Amino acid sequence: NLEQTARRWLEERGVTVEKIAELVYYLQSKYHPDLTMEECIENVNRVISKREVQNAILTGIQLDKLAEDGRLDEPLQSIIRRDEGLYGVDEILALSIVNVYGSIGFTNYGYIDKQKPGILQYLNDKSTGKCNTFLDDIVGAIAAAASSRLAHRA
Amino acid sequence: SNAMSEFIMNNLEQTARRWLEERGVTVEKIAELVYYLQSKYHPDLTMEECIENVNRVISKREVQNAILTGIQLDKLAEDGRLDEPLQSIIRRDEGLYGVDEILALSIVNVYGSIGFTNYGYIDKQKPGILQYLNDKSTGKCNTFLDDIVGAIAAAASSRLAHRA
Amino acid sequence: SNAMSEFIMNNLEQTARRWLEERGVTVEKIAELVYYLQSKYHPDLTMEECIENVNRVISKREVQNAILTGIQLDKLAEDGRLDEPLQSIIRRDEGLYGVDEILALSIVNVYGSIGFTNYGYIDKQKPGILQYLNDKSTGKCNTFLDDIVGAIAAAASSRLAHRA
Amino acid sequence: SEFIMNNLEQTARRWLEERGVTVEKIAELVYYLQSKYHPDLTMEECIENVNRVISKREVQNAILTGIQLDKLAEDGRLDEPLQSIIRRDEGLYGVDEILALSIVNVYGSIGFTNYGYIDKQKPGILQYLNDKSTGKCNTFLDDIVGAIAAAASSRLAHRAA
Numbered sequence: 114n115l116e117q118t119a120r121r122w123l124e125e126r127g128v129t130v131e132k133i134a135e136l137v138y139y140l141q142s143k144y145h146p147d148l149t150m151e152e153c154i155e156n157v158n159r160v161i162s163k164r165e166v167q168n169a170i171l172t173g174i175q176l177d178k179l180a181e182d183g184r185l186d187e188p189l190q191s192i193i194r195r196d197e198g199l200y201g202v203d204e205i206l207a208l209s210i211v212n213v214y215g216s217i218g219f220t221n222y223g224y225i226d227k228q229k230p231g232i233l234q235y236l237n238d239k240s241t242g243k244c245n246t247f248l249d250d251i252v253g254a255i256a257a258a259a260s261s262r263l264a265h266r267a
Numbered sequence: 268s269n270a271m272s273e274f275i276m277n278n279l280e281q282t283a284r285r286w287l288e289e290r291g292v293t294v295e296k297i298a299e300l301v302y303y304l305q306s307k308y309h310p311d312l313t314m315e316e317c318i319e320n321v322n323r324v325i326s327k328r329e330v331q332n333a334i335l336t337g338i339q340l341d342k343l344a345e346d347g348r349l350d351e352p353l354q355s356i357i358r359r360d361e362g363l364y365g366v367d368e369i370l371a372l373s374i375v376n377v378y379g380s381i382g383f384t385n386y387g388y389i390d391k392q393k394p395g396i397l398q399y400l401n402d403k404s405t406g407k408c409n410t411f412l413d414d415i416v417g418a419i420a421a422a423a424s425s426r427l428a429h430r431a
Numbered sequence: 432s433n434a435m436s437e438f439i440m441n442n443l444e445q446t447a448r449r450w451l452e453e454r455g456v457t458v459e460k461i462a463e464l465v466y467y468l469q470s471k472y473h474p475d476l477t478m479e480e481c482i483e484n485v486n487r488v489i490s491k492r493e494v495q496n497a498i499l500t501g502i503q504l505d506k507l508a509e510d511g512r513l514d515e516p517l518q519s520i521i522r523r524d525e526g527l528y529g530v531d532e533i534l535a536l537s538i539v540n541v542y543g544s545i546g547f548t549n550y551g552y553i554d555k556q557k558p559g560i561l562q563y564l565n566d567k568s569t570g571k572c573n574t575f576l577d578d579i580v581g582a583i584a585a586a587a588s589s590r591l592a593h594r595a
Numbered sequence: 596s597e598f599i600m601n602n603l604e605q606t607a608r609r610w611l612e613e614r615g616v617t618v619e620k621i622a623e624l625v626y627y628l629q630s631k632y633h634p635d636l637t638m639e640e641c642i643e644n645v646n647r648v649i650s651k652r653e654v655q656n657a658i659l660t661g662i663q664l665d666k667l668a669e670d671g672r673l674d675e676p677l678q679s680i681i682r683r684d685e686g687l688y689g690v691d692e693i694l695a696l697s698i699v700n701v702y703g704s705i706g707f708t709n710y711g712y713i714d715k716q717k718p719g720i721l722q723y724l725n726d727k728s729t730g731k732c733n734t735f736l737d738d739i740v741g742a743i744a745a746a747a748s749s750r751l752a753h754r755a756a
Contacts, residue, residue, distance in 0.1 A: 172366045176336075186339065195275075224714070224715055227708040264687065383535075383550075386547070446676060517663050525597050526597060533697050
């Protein structure tokens, strides 16, 4: 009942196994020019296929939505809502995701977590009124999680 | 905004302490867990000695950030305000849900890898308050809290150790 | 050589197993800990299913890397070939050194945060081989091995659970 | 117990230098990561943070271990196949990633972003350390210095509010 809920929750906000893959493609496009955008997608599918990751996305977005619609007691409400730089509970879940496939993909998550290419740029809410404080972290975390797998099979 | 940011992030300790008290946890009963872990290695160890450390860990934003988020979900899941399937999963406190363990680690790391073993150790032996927080009969949902209470105890011991 | 790299990173498993044997640890013995960790909940648990789970853990590149590294270090500290002060810190299983626990956590994480609490727990009670590995008088350094065997049993444990 | 070992900050420092890395070189990386976010951020400020980090036992522990392996590897004293795996800096071997993340966590999760970032930019000594044709093994020190910078950088943030 999880593998599923995950993707519709992911989609429900505006993220697809597609743009996610567009990211994994960026992290290893230069190193694997010989590869299909489909390849990326399946690693992404396998990342999202593991419980620990799904176990998070729910928790992650649950807070994002819960903060956006703000039923959060203060100052937690404000903290999350303002994607506070000294607040790191989000990056923690992000880490568990990236950690699923091992140490190998850490420097990765940290690069797209700063830079923020593709949809990560969007999810940093360009004032979309929405709160993507956690997903912006779990998303990129899933990407680099896939980058670490993509290499574990090639 | 920029200054409202600083004000908010520098004023979490008091609130984090209150919530703990509001869920049944006392800095002292946590310190009680610290004596349980560090006693053996420290006969001379004082209860006040521990309290100090417990207070030390709690004075950390990373830990507040943890303590707040933890007791936040613990409540919504207790007031059934959470969406499904998160609501039930968290309310049930099932062994396949790990996030309640991912948060506790971030507290434990605050003082290093050394505290890892003690953490899992009291998370199993559930001595002191942990007993009450893991009790599913009380009607209260302590999915996250009994993990962070144990983590805080661990981290305090990790810090106590770094001091000796 | 890149093809040589593939050949190497793809063939670490049995080496990892041998090194464990050379250091006195058998898959069985590790399996026995998984037993201890899960027999109270699955009385009908067969030692076979335990082994199958421990083998699956060790089949992980991650674990293999941790095993080779930690044993390599115990071996070096044992033949006093490390440089001071690392040499004493590892040979004497120094109290504030957590590099061994850091390596273990990478094994535990292989199967999630669930196996964390079990790892710290067993990494305290020190049953089965752990008792030997911790001994401290056999003239053998097992500072890293101790933790990694504990970590594997705990990851195996977590896997067994995820399945049951 | 043999918990005994007091601060190894001074020894950690020497091992770093002896491997061609100064607190100053690491500080420069801290500037490179915070200079842009802080007006008149001074080098003194960078070195402080770098020193605060390097003074933590958690970090020291990582530094001694990481460097130690790098040394044994370039001297060809490890056991095969670990010897080649470490010497060749095998990308699928992540124990060095492990030790580095170790250093990062000493100062929160804010460092994860800079660790990755300076990891790819590879400025300053990171160019020397990452070379691969100096006949020197820096499989571990590489990540370690990148991590030390990240942590100090993270520390510098917390100590700004």
